[PDB]
Nucleic acid binder design. Structure first.
Lengths: 72, 77
RNA sequence: AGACAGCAUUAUGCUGUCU
RNA sequence: AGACAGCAUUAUGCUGUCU
C-alpha cells in the first residue's frame, strides 16, 4: 500500500459524498451530476483495486479533511 | 441586459471552487498522489474559464462554496 | 504481463449555462 | 449561431497505485 494513494482515495470518497449531498438536495446543475456519475464508477474501481470499503473510506476521508482544515 | 445564471449553476461552481481549495490543501501538505495533483491542475484551469463565462471571481465563489458546504454538512442527518 | 484510476492531445456524439 | 465547462465513445502519448 501507498499512503498518499490511500489518503487521496479516502479524500476523494469524502468529497464525492459532499457533492452527492448537494445533488440530493437538488442544488447542482446537470454537468455537476454528470461528474458525480463518472466519479462514482471510478471510485468503485479504485476501492476494489485497493480492497477498501467505500463507506469506511468515506468516513476516513472526513477525518482527514477536518484535520487539514483545522490546521489552517 | 445581463443575467446571472440559474441558482444551481452558480451553486455548483461555488461548491467546486471550495472543494478545489480543500484538494489544494491536501496537495500543499504533500498528502496526495500524482493523479490527484493531475486533476488539481486540470480543474484550476477549468474553474478560471467557468468563472470568466459566469462573470464570477473564483476567489469569491470559493468563500460562498465554504458556506454552502457547511450548511449542507450541518443539515446532514 | 495483468487490474484499476487519471492527465494530455485527437475524432465523433451529447448535456448544461450564458450571449 | 457563438463562448465556456463537462459527460460519453475513439485514437495516440504519458503519469500513478496494486498483483
Amino acid at each position: 500500500s501507498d499512503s498518499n494513494t490511500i489518503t487521496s482515495f479516502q479524500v476523494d470518497c469524502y468529497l464525492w459524498h459532499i457533492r452527492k449531498l448537494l445533488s440530493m438536495r437538488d442544488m447542482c446543475d446537470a454537468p455537476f451530476d454528470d461528474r458525480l456519475r463518472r466519479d462514482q464508477k471510478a471510485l468503485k474501481g479504485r476501492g476494489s483495486t485497493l480492497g477498501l470499503d467505500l463507506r469506511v473510506a468515506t468516513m476516513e476521508g472526513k477525518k482527514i479533511v477536518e484535520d487539514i482544515l483545522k490546521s489552517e
